[PDB]
Amino acid sequence: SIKQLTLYTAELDRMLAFYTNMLGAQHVHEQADAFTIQLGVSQIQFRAAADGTKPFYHIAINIAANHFQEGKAWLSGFGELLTENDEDQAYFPFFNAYSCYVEDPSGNIIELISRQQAAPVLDKPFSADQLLSIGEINITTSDVEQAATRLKQAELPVKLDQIEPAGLNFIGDQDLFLLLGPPGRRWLFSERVAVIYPLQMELDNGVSLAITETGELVIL
Template identity: 40%
Template sequence: MEIQLLTLQSNNLSKMRTFYIETLGFPLIAEDDHSFRIGVGSSQLEFTSKNVKRNPYYHFAINIPSNLFQEAKAWLKGKVNLLLEDDDDEAYFSFWQAYACYFEDPSGNIVELITRTKENPKSNSPFSIRHMLNISEIGLVVKDAPKVGELLKEFNIYERDNDPITNSSLSFMQDQKNGVFILLTGTGRRWLFSEKKSEIFSMKITLDTNITLGVDDELEFFVANSNYKVT
């Protein structure tokens, strides 16, 4: 699966637009009075101010070429302050053979740049915003993660290692091994490189498999395709 469109809420739309388009240089795809949409490689990312409750924040990750992590990190450090975990500004995940670094945007989202040496392609040109490959991960926080995990199986989306899904675990859900995941979890789990804990906020994920899922304005999970809907 690929994440075609990720729609997140924000109550700092003007600052977010300046940050993503002017500071980081993402291309603007569309905008209106209540939202703007940017291109993230083969994915699109939309922020909307409609029906915002409280101060929503999310965790999402962006894939970058497998050989450009240090270049990407240096590029990012020239624009934002990198987040730290145990005084380190990068992480190595041995089970993925992956490197990642993290930053916060004006809405407090925890954003990750990640390179997976097995899945992500290489590039021969110096790193730039054009090297963002796609949205790699999105944290999906729900009231009942085991129940949602069972519902996702009906759409052929499974935990990557078939491990048990609990409300306290972070379950990597996918339908193929291509470095794109829905990170399923319950509330109260600390996001890596942040002191923030997972909370439920409205969001929508549109996949290239004709599936739309997320959390509605009543903070309830939903998933549907053109022929079948589950809430």
């Protein structure tokens, strides 16, 4: 799992307000030029972006197998559900998962993903407290092959021979997938195209990595 994910935002105040309203004050902690949100076992720290930049990312959050429709209703309370092909939800056969989407104030593509066999069945109502963990984060890089190699050296599940430098590459198993790809292409459910912005993350296993502002994946 992702223990800590650090992202940048040009809209810190609006984002603070948005996530405090969505998740509750108990899940959000404000700092001077950053704040954190707790998503189950995962934390995201949003930091002030450099002037003249407007970073955004694609983040999917795991929810229970049996709570996709509740999650979808809940999400729609915070913004208009995104659509693709006139559909306001998606089914992904490869992940056997249902997904729904909204944009936050920075234009982040916030997905709720309900993995039908790779998530728990929770016999209990859905709420902000039932966001399980981070299920997806884009790793948008200036060198996909170099990135894949470093990730495998970091001992992450990478099938090097399958890596497509020009497309999206799913890295992981179970309930967490890093979306490794180049910039350029429009994200599903969004007007926005993949663009390199910096981030860093620490995994549950103690592995930590960074994407520099030029798109280099660097294993910290």
